[PDB]
Amino acid sequence: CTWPAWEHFKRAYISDGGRVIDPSDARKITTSEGQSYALFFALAADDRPMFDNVLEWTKDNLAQGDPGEHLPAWLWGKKDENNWTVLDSNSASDADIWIAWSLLEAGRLWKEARYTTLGNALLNRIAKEEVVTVPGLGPMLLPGKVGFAEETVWRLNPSYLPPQIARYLTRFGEPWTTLQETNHRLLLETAPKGFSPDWVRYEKSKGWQLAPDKTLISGYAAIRVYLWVGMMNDHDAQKASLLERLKPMAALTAKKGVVPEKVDVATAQPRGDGPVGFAAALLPFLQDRDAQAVQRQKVADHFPGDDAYFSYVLTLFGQGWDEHRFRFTPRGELQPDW
Numbered sequence: 001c002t003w004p005a006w007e008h009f010k011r012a013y014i015s016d017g018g019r020v021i022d023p024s025d026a027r028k029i030t031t032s033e034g035q036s037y038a039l040f041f042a043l044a045a046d047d048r049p050m051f052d053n054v055l056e057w058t059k060d061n062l063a064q065g066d067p068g069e070h071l072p073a074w075l076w077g078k079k080d081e082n083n084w085t086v087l088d089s090n091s092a093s094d095a096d097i098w099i100a101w102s103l104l105e106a107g108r109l110w111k112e113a114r115y116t117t118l119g120n121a122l123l124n125r126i127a128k129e130e131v132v133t134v135p136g137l138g139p140m141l142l143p144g145k146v147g148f149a150e151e152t153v154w155r156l157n158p159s160y161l162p163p164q165i166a167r168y169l170t171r172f173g174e175p176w177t178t179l180q181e182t183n184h185r186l187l188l189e190t191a192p193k194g195f196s197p198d199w200v201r202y203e204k205s206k207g208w209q210l211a212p213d214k215t216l217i218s219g220y221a222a223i224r225v226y227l228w229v230g231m232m233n234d235h236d237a238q239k240a241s242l243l244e245r246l247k248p249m250a251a252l253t254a255k256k257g258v259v260p261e262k263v264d265v266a267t268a269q270p271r272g273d274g275p276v277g278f279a280a281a282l283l284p285f286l287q288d289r290d291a292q293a294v295q296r297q298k299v300a301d302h303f304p305g306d307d308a309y310f311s312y313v314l315t316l317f318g319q320g321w322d323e324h325r326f327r328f329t330p331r332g333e334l335q336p337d338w
Ligand SMILES: OC[C@H]1O[C@@H](O[C@H]2[C@H](O)[C@@H](O)[C@H](O[C@H]3[C@H](O)[C@@H](O)[C@H](O[C@H]4[C@H](O)[C@@H](O)[C@@H](O)O[C@@H]4CO)O[C@@H]3CO)O[C@@H]2CO)[C@H](O)[C@@H](O)[C@@H]1O
Pocket: 031, 032, 033, 074, 088, 090, 091, 092, 093, 094, 095, 143, 144, 145, 146, 147, 148, 221
């Protein structure tokens, strides 16, 4: 029947009108990411009323009524004391992808063609507006429709296309067929010490820009890479290759029992202790039963409060998967626990 942590999330973080609010920002923001994760969780929980409430808010307030015609603006909130509105009209493609996947899986599982039609239109718009062929790489997913592509340099975010979602989307043909391959190579090629970067640049005639840099780190974006990989179905033939490349994050977490806040991608040097959400995010990733139980204790004893949006959503994914609240099939479909 119910998923208690999701029920609490609805009460503490989602407005009556269907917007996920990050309370830690003075502008009391909603992001397209937060909306997209709420759609996913509502679908996993078999919660069509909240799915629809969140979807309608997203459509009307981020997408000018129709995500098939307008990619959702990524940031919304208090712009001035008399104006709650879009704060940045640019898209975030990780959210766009999670919205598209959630609509397509809701349409399939709830047998609702309206969701399928909207998911298809949004997917097509993602391909049109934030997928480009990068010389040397092929088709790649940009992090947003503006701001990440210049004539000779591009910036990517390895957390933005979960491998299981890339595998699911290949059913729609190109560019998704090729994007699944370029995404897999992105993940393998940009983790030279086994740590995936938050953001990474590719430069024409030069390749991936992996030199040591205080900004080339596995942090609050890339923690999601390990989470997505951990939640891949074991029968996905590529899960093993990704676990093997990212194994240093598992070995480092097991060593002192603390997920690092930031790891230098070029040197593997860690700094800081990650929040509880990082512990939960590694639950599906850690294959060793003892290392995973150490992190489980931290999530149990330091479960995120109502002032911790990001750790809460990482916990709904990571603890949710740890509790069998949802699974992915080998093709990246939702295998629901309804
Ligand atoms: O125009 C001046 C300047 O713009 C640069 O492009 C910007 C672009 O204007 C801006 O919209 C975009 O903002 C990103 C933001 O940095 C990013 O953090 C956010 O990502 C979401 C995502 O959903 C998350 O899951 C995770 O990434 O965090 C947030 C949600 O919390 O997405 C927005 C939208 O893409 O950043 C661009 C690059 O900085 C130009 O590059 C520059 O040349 C110009 O000078």
